[PDB]
Paper text:
Here, we reported the enzymatic characterizations and crystal structures of marine bacterial esterases CrmE10 and AlinE4. The results showed that both CrmE10 and AlinE4 belong to the SGNH-hydrolase superfamily and the bacterial lipolytic enzyme GDSL family. The SGNH-hydrolase family, a superfamily that includes the bacterial lipolytic enzyme GDSL family, consists of enzymes possessing four strictly conserved residues, Ser, Gly, Asn, and His, in four conserved blocks, I, II, III, and V, respectively.
The CrmE10 structure was composed of 12 α-helices (including three 310-helices) and 5 β-strands. The N-terminal region had a compact architecture that was mainly composed of five predominant β-strands (β1–β5) surrounded by eight α-helices (α1–α8). The C-terminal region was a long α-helix, α9 (Ala184–Asp203), that extended away from the subunit core and wrapped in the other chain. In CrmE10 and AlinE4 structures, catalytic residue Ser was located on helix α1, and residues Asp and His were located on the loop between helix η3 (CrmE10) or helix η2 (AlinE4) and helix α9, which were typically different from other esterases. As mutants CrmE10-S29A and CrmE10-D178A had no activity, the results showed that residues Ser29 and Asp178 influenced the enzymatic activity of CrmE10 by domain swapping. Thus, dimerization participated in the active sites of CrmE10, and this mechanism might also fit AlinE4 due to the similar architecture, which was different from other homologs. The region of these five sites in CrmE10 formed a negative potential surface; however, the corresponding region was full of positive potential in AlinE4. CrmE10 had about 30% activity at 4 °C and showed no activity above 40 °C, which indicated that CrmE10 was a cold-active enzyme.
Residue numbers in the entry:
A (entry chain B), B (entry chain A): 12 to 205
The structure:
Amino acid sequence: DAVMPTGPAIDVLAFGDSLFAGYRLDRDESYPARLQAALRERGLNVNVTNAGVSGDTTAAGLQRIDFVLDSMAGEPDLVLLELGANDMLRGLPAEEARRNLDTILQRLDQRDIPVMVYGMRAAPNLGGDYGRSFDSIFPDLADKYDAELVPFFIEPLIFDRSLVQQDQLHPTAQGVDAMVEQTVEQVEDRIDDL
Amino acid sequence: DAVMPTGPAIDVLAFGDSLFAGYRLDRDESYPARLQAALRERGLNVNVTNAGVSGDTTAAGLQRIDFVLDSMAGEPDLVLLELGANDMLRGLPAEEARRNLDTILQRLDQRDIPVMVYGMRAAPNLGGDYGRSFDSIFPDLADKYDAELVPFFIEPLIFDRSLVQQDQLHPTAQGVDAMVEQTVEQVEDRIDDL
Ligand SMILES: [Ca+2]
Ligand SMILES: [Ca+2]
Ligand SMILES: [Ca+2]
Ligand SMILES: [Ca+2]
Ligand SMILES: [Ca+2]
Ligand SMILES: [Ca+2]
Ligand SMILES: [Ca+2]
């Protein structure tokens, strides 16, 4: 079933945030490494460089894109661009993300490097207006720069919670209240006893 | 129902990580702020200082405990100590978390500041051996230093997903495989077409 890779080496740069970096995974388990393996199994002589940085916003990506590109052994043949999630999770304006991704795409145009734009979706609790403004960044910019759009690539995670890390729990406001109800009697006693 | 607080202020220092800092929450929604409100409703004249820092390991906490204490207007009457989760989540050695928490409790003993130790439990991703060495840190150190143990105060979060932030999804290794299966055909086509 597997096809031996042949042909000249194809350098792919995976430029993104935690979803490329492999948050809390071994580097060889991250999306860029596993994608490399799957492409090579199909006969493509591909090397994927993992330039994912957990926590990167579109601003942080723009700040380092030229350096990351310069640091490769020649220009890459293809860039995978996956940023925006951290802007949304931090409540930064959708317009700033759009502008920073636009600039990144301008820089790749200037270097004649083709790109695939990985789309991202805003959390529902940011409201419908933010959702429409953020979610449309990716198809709009893919269209403007004649890049392919990759649909939300974490969609499998939405439909199978077993595919999502469950080790790290952050409370909502109501979760905090439950934590207080569970501890206030003990803390009250301790303070009263000082 | 509320009891008006009376008497001199009682200063409580909440020294911890994201479970005290209020990760992606407003200040008034964090555990230290909600704990303060609950205690004052019961008639205690308490001021809880939120010294939570998201991301803090036991080593990071040890590094800043003296600076944090030396920056208060007088020493606190009580410290709530809540660290270890980030050591665990990063697979850092349980023995080093134990040693750092021990040193913190030693410095608090030396300043005669009472302490409540907030226990933490290792995630299942860490395996049984790690869990047994990590989970015992908190009752062991609470007994050694004659401090109270607050058992596992995020217990309500484990059992009710509605109390836990769901906006940030990180794949397991299996989740990454699913993301590759969702995108490989499109990436293969784009590389083939270069
Ligand atoms: Ca003492
Ligand atoms: Ca002592
Ligand atoms: Ca003494
Ligand atoms: Ca084709
Ligand atoms: Ca084609
Ligand atoms: Ca195509
Ligand atoms: Ca070709």
